[PDB]
Amino acid sequence: QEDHVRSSFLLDNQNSQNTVTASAGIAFLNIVNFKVETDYISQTSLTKDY
Amino acid sequence: VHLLSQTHEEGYSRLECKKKCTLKIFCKTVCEDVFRVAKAEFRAYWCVAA
């Protein structure tokens, strides 16, 4: 009896996360006040199995 | 000798991933699926004695 067992496994994972926060606030002597902020979060995950 | 030239259509879903880099600093690997109906023309012939 002759048995040959060949097993090959491959796994790859790439995760990219980008977070951008931009805030601007101007406050005068109780006469003018403007505050703004913007947050952008992007996450991409890719998994490859074989 | 021209035996028969016809066409065949088949729809398949293809998954493709691209590494898009916006502003040369925001890089992300985005994968998208497209259902393409590919059409191919097949021409079968036959060789007779001249």
DSSP assignment of A6-47 equals: -----EEEEEEEEEEEEEEEEE-SSS-EEEEEEEEEEEEEEE
Rounded CA-CA distance A50/A34 in Å is 54
DSSP structural state of residue B1: -
Give the other-Cβ count within 10 Å of A41's Cβ.
9
Contact B26 A42 (CB under 8 A): yes
Q: Which residues pair with B13 in a beta bridge?
A: B35
The tokens for A5 are: 């067992």
- Say which experimental method was used: cryo-EM
Q: How far apart are CA B1 and CA B20, in angstroms?
A: 50
Closest to B27 measured CA to CA, from A18, A22, A21? A18
Amino acid letter, residue A10: L
| Length of chain B in terms of residues written | 50
- CA B24 – CA B20 distance, rounded (Å): 9
Query: What is the DSSP code (8-state) at residue B48?
Result: -
Question: Nearest-CA residue of chain A relative to B18?
Answer: A46
How far is it, in rounded angstroms, from Cα B1 to Cα B46?
6
Q: Which residues of A touch B17 (CB under 8 A)?
A: 46
Distance from CA of B12 to the nearest CA of A (A): 20
Best residue in A44, A45, A47, A49 to probe B by mutation, most B CBs within 10 Å? A44
